[PDB]
Amino acid sequence: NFFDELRIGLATAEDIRQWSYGEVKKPETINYRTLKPEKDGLFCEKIFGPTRDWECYCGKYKRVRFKGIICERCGVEVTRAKVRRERMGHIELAAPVTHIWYFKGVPSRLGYLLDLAPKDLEKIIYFAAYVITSVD
């Protein structure tokens, strides 16, 4: 244990995709019958990790000797079952979205930074009025 600082700060999208071990695409959690997480779903093993220690989706890898190797057909890294607790996912938004806290929390930090007002910001962001990015 070597702790000295917790420097919290704004996380840019670059950092968000930096943490992510993969990218969940579809909203598929678990198969209907075999009870297995889907591929590219909210639980996909390749993204977060194997749900069983020393296994993979297709299961051709079961021994411990080849630890730290990701399979071919299913592409699951052979690691501990507990590694899912740590590896984090991410999702790419088609259009940008505003963090609720900075927008709505009183006083509106976004509005104060941009000199705008709370109801005005509510109007622009939620598609109720237009705003001019710039003009020459």
Partner DNA sequence: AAGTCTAACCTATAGGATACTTACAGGGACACGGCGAAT
Partner DNA sequence: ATTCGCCGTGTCCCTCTCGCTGGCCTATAGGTTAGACTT
> Residues at the annotated binding site?
56, 58, 71, 74
Smallest distance, Å, CB 92 to DNA? 19
Tell me how many degrees the CA angle 27-31-36 measures, rounded to the nearest 5.
Answer: 105
In this structure, what DSSP letter does residue 83 have?
G
Nearest residue to 31 (alpha-carbon basis) of 18, 20, 44: 44
Check binding of 56 to Zn ion (CB under 5 A).
yes
Check binding of 32 to another protein (CB under 8 A).
no
Question: Which of 17/52 has CB closer to Zn ion?
Answer: 52
Which tokens in the block code for residue 116?
A: 């705008």
Spatial separation of the C-alpha atoms in residues 36 and 45, rounded to whole Å: 9
For 111, the enclosing helix (H) or strand (E) is helix 109-114
Which tokens in the block code for residue 26?
A: 């579809």
Check binding of 125 to another protein (CB under 8 A).
yes
Smallest distance, Å, CB 10 to Zn ion? 39
Applying CB under 8 A, which residues contact another protein? 1-13, 15-17, 19-20, 24-27, 29-30, 35, 42-43, 48, 82, 84-102, 104-105, 107, 109-110, 112-113, 115, 125-127
Applying CB under 7 A, which residues contact DNA? 106-108, 111, 117-119
